[PDB]
Design a protein around this ligand. Structure first.
Ligand SMILES: CCCCCCCC/C=C\CCCCCCCC(=O)O[C@H](COC(=O)CCCCCCC/C=C/CCCCCCCC)COP(=O)(O)OCCN
Lengths: 59, 71
């Protein structure tokens, strides 16, 4: 079985075209990326305090 | 005596794992966004209308005072 990754056709009604124009002019997806980064700032980092803390190992 | 003991999945298997793409749509129409922009523009225009007319009156008053002092 196989899937299509980029086989969508954008709608050409007035509402869809207006939505795409609003995206182009007001930079909505750029704001979405900014929001993702902003949210990702307010979470705890993954850094450990070497050499006072050490990475996990195995026997 | 002891039976075999090695790394095996628990009985009944593991819990289902999500793999589908999850890109939710936040939700706000382009008409609504344009309406918000136009509304804030109009509100700013009206406020600055009022303030600039008041500033014109203040400047006229200052000019009146200067005219009175000139001779
Ligand atoms: C009733 C009377 C009203 C009078 C009419 C007024 C109505 C106004 C309606 C339109 C206003 C919109 C203008 C805003 C600028 C739009 C310019 C634009 O859309 O250009 C983009 C380009 O925009 C960009 O790509 C810029 C991205 C740069 C990265 C910056 C990240 C954006 C987020 C940062 C926050 C922005 C903060 C803004 C406020 C700053 C305050 C000082 C088009 O490029 P493409 O989509 O690639 O298509 C071109 C091929 N045909």
């Amino acid at each position: 079985t196989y899937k299509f990754v980029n086989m969508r056709e954008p709608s050409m009604d007035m509402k869809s075209v207006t939505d795409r124009a609003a995206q182009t002019l007001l930079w909505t997806e750029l704001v979405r990326g900014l929001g993702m980064t902003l949210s990702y700032l307010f979470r705890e980092p993954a850094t450990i305090n070497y050499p006072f803390e050490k990475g996990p190992l195995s026997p | 005596a002891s039976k075999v003991k090695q790394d095996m999945p628990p009985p009944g298997g593991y819990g289902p794992i999500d793999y589908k793409r999850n890109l939710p749509r936040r939700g706000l129409s382009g008409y609504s966004m344009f309406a918000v922009g136009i509304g804030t523009l109009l509100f700013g225009y009206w406020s600055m209308m009022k303030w600039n007319r008041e500033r014109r009156r203040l400047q006229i008053e200052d000019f009146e005072a200067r005219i009175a002092l000139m001779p």
